[PDB]
Amino acid sequence: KPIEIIGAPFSKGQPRGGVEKGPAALRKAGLVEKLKETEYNVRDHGDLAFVDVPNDSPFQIVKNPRSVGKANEQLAAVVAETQKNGTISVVLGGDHSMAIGSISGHARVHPDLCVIWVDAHTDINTPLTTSSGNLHGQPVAFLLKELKGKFPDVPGFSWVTPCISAKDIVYIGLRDVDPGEHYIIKTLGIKYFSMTEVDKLGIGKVMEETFSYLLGRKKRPIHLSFDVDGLDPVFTPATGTPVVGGLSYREGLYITEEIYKTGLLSGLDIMEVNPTLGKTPEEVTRTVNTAVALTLSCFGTKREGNHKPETDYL
């Protein structure tokens, strides 16, 4: 199989700066090469340079709208672009609002996809709900159909087309959800697994379930949008919003691991890494490798080992 990496050095989805340095640190952590070490061919597409929207106005509360609308428009494009060639898209990112882009682009070639969302937050707030115009906390509200026309069309996201219903999305790692968001997920009946569910079933069953629930009938392609923050802060400290009591490195590596073991991975998102939001240099480095590690997980590497087949190591 083939792998193409897209860098989404962006950050207007939120205030704290650095997230665009995300793909910059990830490649520096040698993400590309290690990936090559697998059975997958890897092509690095570089960093989609994003033209800045002069005089971007705050649509009511929502900020830097046009920016996030055009930046995400440019991305979805490249994604659908690769997706058609048949390669697996892996979006190194800045804030998690590049999810619309990625996800959209993906749905163009595979409109039957599901979505596993590992984030501490649902990020399912709308321009109406959000107590901030930080679109990095709305990505699902743009991709959801059951939410279309449920809020004033936003300046820059015209090209966006609600592509999936709540019956194809699955959240894992939720532990910091806003009122409005809780409403939405309950109302629209969205299958999720808050830390409390993790706690109850155990990552194993959590994954086991989520799968049947999504690939029970028709096996479709998967889009794992992973938010480096959905792990506990002790593991991925260099982030925008940390939230104690989250997924463990182990649990996180278990997810990408069961994901891989299903061969249905199509699109991958490694968002929210802020190479600057480090209390200490280590914390960053930590955050960086664990992230890196989580990628190579989705692409083969098992915690039990790997050995090139047909070769007699004896």
Next chain:
Amino acid sequence: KPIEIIGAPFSKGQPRGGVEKGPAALRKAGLVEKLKETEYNVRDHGDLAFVDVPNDSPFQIVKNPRSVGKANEQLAAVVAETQKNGTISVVLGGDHSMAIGSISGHARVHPDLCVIWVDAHTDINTPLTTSSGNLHGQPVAFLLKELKGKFPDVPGFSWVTPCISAKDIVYIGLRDVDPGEHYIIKTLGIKYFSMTEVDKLGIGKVMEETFSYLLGRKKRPIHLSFDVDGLDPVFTPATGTPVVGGLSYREGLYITEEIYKTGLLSGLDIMEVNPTLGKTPEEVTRTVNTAVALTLSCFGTKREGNHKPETDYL
């Protein structure tokens, strides 16, 4: 429902000083207000000032007896006092020996209550057993009937009336139990779940069980005496006795969470917080919020979110 908070700034139950600063730090962490943010009405009762017993003699080995006898006598009173009005009692505390007070006061209005004891220790030692007169390690021995007249009446605890048998008490998080104590719990057949049990079943099943075992037949009121030290030291470092390999923040939040989801909470104890026993300021702060967090847990807050009902956030 209504909530009344009682501060038990005390510490003679043990040597290390600071535990009385407990309710002092907890309120400072804004425990009161956050609580108001729920569906419960909250009334802060303040800190029961405790008159000191001049010349308190060490009953054999047991120390500061009269102190702990009168301090706990004053408390039980206020507790039964609120309990009658129908509000939920929440005892911010100093050492865990204010459990007799709280628990007693509670049993006066609801003598059919059970008790969930999250502590690293059983604290079920008697004046006979204890290798210390630290009554913060005997609270159950005073409340237990099967232990009445099993030791020399203690100077100051006359007013104390063994209120519950081993069939209504449940320990969770035990990992540092003394010989004598092991004897007692086995002999008197006390349902418990040592870390090893936690390890085996998984907090989920651990709670699931404990409930049936207590609320299987007659659903009664619950008295969760939570000992901030039953969590692992990495989570609640600012304590008297830390004991590695204990409950995780997650597991601890899972408990208070399943407790809440049963609407049977009547009395709550947040003991053993020593705002001074911090290797570093953070450790305290850590200890403080996690504690605070554990309270608001027992009162609604879920790790999946909360949203005021009947309001359309759309």
Next chain:
Amino acid sequence: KPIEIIGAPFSKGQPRGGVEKGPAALRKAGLVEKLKETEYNVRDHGDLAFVDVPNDSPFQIVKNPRSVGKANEQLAAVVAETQKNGTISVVLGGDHSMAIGSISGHARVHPDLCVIWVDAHTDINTPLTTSSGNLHGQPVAFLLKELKGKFPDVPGFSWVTPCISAKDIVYIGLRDVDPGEHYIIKTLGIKYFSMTEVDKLGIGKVMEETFSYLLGRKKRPIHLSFDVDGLDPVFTPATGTPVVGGLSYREGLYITEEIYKTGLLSGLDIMEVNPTLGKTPEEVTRTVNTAVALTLSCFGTKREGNHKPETDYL
């Protein structure tokens, strides 16, 4: 029952020095006395002084061969020596290559034994595979029959006799396995439980299984070769190779605990402790006690308590 402790202050199995100081720190942590506190009689055998092999040549890639061959020859001997008297052998160690010695010596008296291997690594590499002559990463390859004559006889391990097949060995905690090693374990069909398996089943089921798989038919003696490094680095930092995302103190204490509860413990290995590889003095101390703790676990101590029988603590 009787316990005899053997100190294997050795380290040529690998580069980093200090591991021979292993038994030196363990006794200093009072391992001997605490052990006496159990229902087992304990005899400390002291530290097998190891005569150094002048001019030890690097068999191709493999280093300090003759050293590790004679040091392990001297050990197996003492082990079989005690094993015959009926006492339980407990090898405090230096690098994990003293496993051949221990294990061999054990098989002499009980050739029907199985083996539980808690290590981050399989250490099942051969002189052919290893990208290092560090025999501390080959111990199983010398003890395995299915591997005999699968590599050039090594200078110093003549006396070694492949004693067990892959049907009697069980690995727990694997998370850093080399290519060649993966080949071997898959090929030779070796029952294991990588962190991912731990993650899936939960230490409880992991142990529950491993047992039936080994003691299902004929109950035999157990040889728990525990590698202090198989726990997460946060717990046992003072080691040669740390590997993030490993067994928790709890999970590790759960293992030795279920091991003990089967009364089938015959030989115990507490390897890879490097009293010098400590970022800070605490880290060592940490590493030391947790190790110590893991021993006393295999010998009675439960996390629920212990009380001398036939004594009325009332």
